[PDB]
Amino acid sequence: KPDPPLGLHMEITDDGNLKISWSSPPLVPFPLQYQVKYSENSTTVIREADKIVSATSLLVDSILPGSSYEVQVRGKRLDGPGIWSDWSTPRVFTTQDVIYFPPKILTSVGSNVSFHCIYKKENKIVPSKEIVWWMNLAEKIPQSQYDVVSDHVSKVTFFNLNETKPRGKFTYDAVYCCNEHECHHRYAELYVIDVNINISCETDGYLTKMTCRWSTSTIQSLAESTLQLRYHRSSLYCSDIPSIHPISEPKDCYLQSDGFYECIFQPIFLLSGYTMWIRINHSLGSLDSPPTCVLPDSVVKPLPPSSVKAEITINIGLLKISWEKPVFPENNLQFQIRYGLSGKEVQWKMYEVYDAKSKSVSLPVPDLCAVYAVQVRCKRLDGLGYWSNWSNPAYTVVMDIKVPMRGPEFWRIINGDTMKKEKNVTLLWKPLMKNDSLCSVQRYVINHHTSCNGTWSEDVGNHTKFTFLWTEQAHTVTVLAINSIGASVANFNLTFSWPMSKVNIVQSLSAYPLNSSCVIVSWILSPSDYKLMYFIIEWKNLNEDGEIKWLRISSSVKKYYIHDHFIPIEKYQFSLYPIFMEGVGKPKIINSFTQD
Template sequence: MVLRWILAALLQEYITISIASPGVHILPPSGLYFSYLSTNDSSYSSLWEGPAPEEVNKQQRNISCINVEHSRTAQYGVLCLWNGIGHNPETIVQDYVEFKKIIFPSDAHLVDHTWHLQCSMGVNSTQITCSIQYITQEKNTMNLESMPHLYYASRDDKDEDTMGADCRCDRHEGCECSLSPTIHSASYILWMEIPHPTTSLRSPPLRLLTAAIIKLDPPTDLRVEITSDGKLKVLWSIMAPSSPSVQCQVKRSVNTTEEISAPSYAIVEETYVIFEVPQSCSPMVFEVRCRKLPELGVWSNWSPPMVFKSQDGYYFPQRAAVSSGSSVSFFCMYCDKNKKIPAKAITWGLNLVEQIPSRQYMAVSDYVGKVTTDSLNTTTPKGKFQFDALYCCARGIECQPKYAEIYVIDTNISITCETNAKITFMTCRWIPKKIIPLKDITFTFRYYVELDYSNEMLIKYNTSTIKSCDLQQDGHYECVFNRIQTMHSYHMWVEIQHPSGALRSPPVSLRPLDVVKPSAPTMVKAKRVADTIQDIRYLQVTWGRPRPALKDIFYQLRYRLRGQEAEWQVVDIYRKASANITNVDVCQANTIQVRCQLVNVSKIWSDWTNAIDTEVTDFNDPLRGPEFWRIITKNSIQKGDNITLVWKPLQKEESLCSIRGYELVQQVSNIISWSTYVGNVTNYTLTLQGSTVTVSIRAVNSLGQSKMNHNLTLSKDMSTVKAVRSLDVYALNSTVLAVWTMAPVSYDVVGFVLEWRNLRERSQMHWTYIPPNISRYYIKDQFYAIEKYQFSLTPVFLEGVASPYITYEFSKVDTDEMQNNTGLYIILPAITATSFLLVITLAISHQRMKRLFWKEVPNPKYCSWAQGVNFQKVSLSTSGSSFCSLYSHKKNSSEKSY
């Protein structure tokens, strides 16, 4: 009502009241106050311009006022423009009270009205927002007619530029006004006006500098750390444009169970503030706001409150990711029953099963303890727990329910790179198989390039660049560098990101020129070679030189039998683009591959060439034909006997390397002969009709026939010749020894054929050729004592095959002695005769000694004097004659007495 009365009085004078000022006032970032005060005492109506009196200026206030006198009402009014000194919205009322004490030392006034004007502009906004707040100590409210208006212009010299701001007012609090975003000038001229149909209260022109009213976004990411000396460090992040510095204000309050204590403030020009650790276990609440410097921009809004609770214990860090074998330190504050545990009483445990030694503890302050763990092993996930739990305890008895999480990761990732043969790009590969599959873990490949090359240089991690890599099907990551700088150094590593922290693999430094991977050799060929002069056969392998075509090239050739998974045999070759492999079976197909390495350029091998397989082909006539034997079957129906020739397949070294078949040659005389190709078989049956025929078997391959062949003459006349006198067969465990003697014949023996078979099983007859100069032979076969066998020995002469000697029984002899001494069958009769003669000799000697002894020594049975004499005690030194004399003397004496 008072305001209405004053405005009505002003209406009658038809004027607009404003502060008389020669210039334009600067609107500071903290804003200005516009006040109207009225009183009936003219003693308080002195005009102030510029700085306030000395007692006011001490508080850094600037006040500009003008007197207003109403003749009809005899009221005196004052219009003032002034600034506050507070930093907080909570101090606006305090500024208002202090101002009234300066203008009116007493309360002798009728009415007062004050508006606070402050403008701001967001960091990423082009719109200016001005807040007009109505302030009065009597809690009066503005009525609708006295709502403030705000006008602005981009230039202060043209009234036609004046525009009205878009204001939205609340009669109880104030207005929010927006300046059009289409105006992009660096400064504006503002007027605040309290309107009325006939008159108004108008502020002086105010210059608004947009650079000074930037309002930052509220700080984010508030967090608490513990410093190395055991203090609380509150940190935050701000998104501020480029400026020399930023000023921040931290508000701290303690939240007890009864009430929230009065906040305390701290102003810093950093993004952190450090506090002492309080003894109380009550939670603390932190809020932060910031503004630009040196323009002292508008304060940002307060950040969301961050509540720091230490009553249940607090760890810093609360979780950490470290590499295997490294060490990490943790801090702890422990409250028990709302009282902080002294740092000296804090102990530590790992996973609730392992107590950390006390030598790793440290009290960094009164209530903050520290532990350092070292030589950590890689974490093994335990169900949903993918970390090791570190517990802070009180005197080793009671531990906190909370714990710190330690993620120990094996960072030994091997990075291998190779440059293509044309040196146009480089491919690097790495695989994180050793890293445990932790949740939310990611990998980033980073690198940087520099001209200088040194393995001992410091890695510049901050200058690195991320390189995209593709995951391959085998689990490897592949990163391709195009347009490489061959003589520059590439430093690279893998960064492992985890919510608990980031780790790096050991860095790798290399030059693309040092990791050139050459192309594989070309035109690999292989052929088998036979040297008939030196009688050697080998595999000759040749290939073409790779690109780049350097002289110093190291080759490796590997080979193995085709179709087998046997171990590769590797041959090293220097410079020469060929190799002769002698220790290989040239009669079998082999698989061959070749690769190369650039000597003094790179240690990387090329890929193996495509595998080539050698072909098995004949490279000479067979050396000889097979040995064969005949089996005779009597034929009572046809004329002549059926002769079955049997032979064993030739060995590869004899057939060189394969056999297509065999050819049977029959020769009746020096003139008559014929041959028959029998194919690739091992037996052939023919009918022997003539009296004598000589047969031989030739081996045939693609290059010809064997020149050295085994001959066998079949003659009916010679088949009746009995040349074997005896055949003894001795069983020696599972083998058999055959011994024979020959009767004198007038033919030359060219060999023997020993045959044997199991009669019970009626098995096939086994046979073997034996040289003519021996008379015993070990048969290497399985023989059993309970089985019956047939053995036969057949002499072979040039004239034909003699009659076989057949036996069915084993000879009776100690088989153990036969086995231990193979010549026992020869010396056994001599040993027996010698033993018999030795027994006879010992018997004769024994009788003679007996007679000689009793001839000299009397028999006590028939000699009374000899009874009771102990002849064993007779002196051995007594000679024979003395003994005889004694004997004669005793005898004579006995006779006399008898």
């Protein structure tokens, strides 16, 4: 004689059927057959039914609203002349007037869902034509969606569902079935949850671990929801269409400060396909997010290229950049090089190199003697991968790269009493500017040329002034700039000749101050058999022991704007020297601004 069945419970299925369930007594090592006695007591009809079942549950079709179910169960040994147990204690279950089927639906965005309902009014089932549906008590659902499956039951069909927006605490949309204008308190719950969760992974530059991330932002609306990443590992590569696999394993994920979950795969199978999805285990049901497959080799974030060196090639003047490819991946790679002038903000120019066996590139640069910042990054040449981070900036060292392009502009002071055949000539120049020096000037050398002594050279070092004795009828001087490579390519010369110093071609010369920052100097030329190359204008204060200022001007010029501080009260001397191949001509000189 078995003990009576225990734990008699009664639940309503989503179809609206009454499932009576019980537990077998734990002490019987043999199957039991059960007899269920039940009564269904409605307001108008009593039905009694005895059913024999071998299962520990019974379905009773279509639960009647406003009815009382009484249930008893007894057990007997299935095999042989078993004795029946006593009956279970009777259990009463009292139902409600209004039925929705289903009571709840859990779906994803873009799906189709349909509900059926029955509305009881004073122990009567109303016709489906009367039933009207409403959403959130706000508004009536359009009639086109309604379908009359039968006279008693009405149905609503929803298409292309959009995510339910939460209103306060309530995560779901309340759908109502009403008899015409007047509605009832009870409603159906609609839960639509965005399962479109983006899982992104990144393999470290050392191929030692795999990092996965995913956001919570769509799911912070459901309290009581638990989230579990599940994954399935393939033997090789990813399938063309990812799918949920019945055999899956969970992964330990940790919520970060930025609101994202982190899942760490360590150690790694470089060529195993990782299929991932999120399991949402709601209080009633499990939903799986769309599965995505990731290949760790195709999600590798490579290390930046190391040992980056930027040098300007001697003699050639190209920014030569070199580096070492990062260990991974060893597959062919493409490189991106950004370069720019070093400053608070670098105007990066981009260049791409697709040669796999390329380790250094040479790019023309406009200024050879500036520091450029250069950063390099890499990606798989076939495009199947991510870009590496930019390398740590490399900086050039300023070194001389060519001989100086041009020799310095120079002038002369003549210290000598008119009665002596010998005159001291002090040559004066300024240091070359960066464009002419390129990078550096190590020394100046003066080449002398004379009819009697020929050509000789005098090393002046880093001095900007030199004084020599002018004795001969003609003495040409040339100042060269020398760096570690050699002497300047294009050099200025000046011939000092005694006969020519009487030749005067400047008919008139006038100077007019425009303002305290500009004086116009203008001159008129007489015709001359000598080919004039250029002029030099010289000006000095006569009230101060000011340095003699001078400037070279093209011979094509007949008027010049001198920008300098000119005091209209002070007397300035302006000297215009005409310069010919045979040398510096006789100056025209004025000692006052022209007042006319």
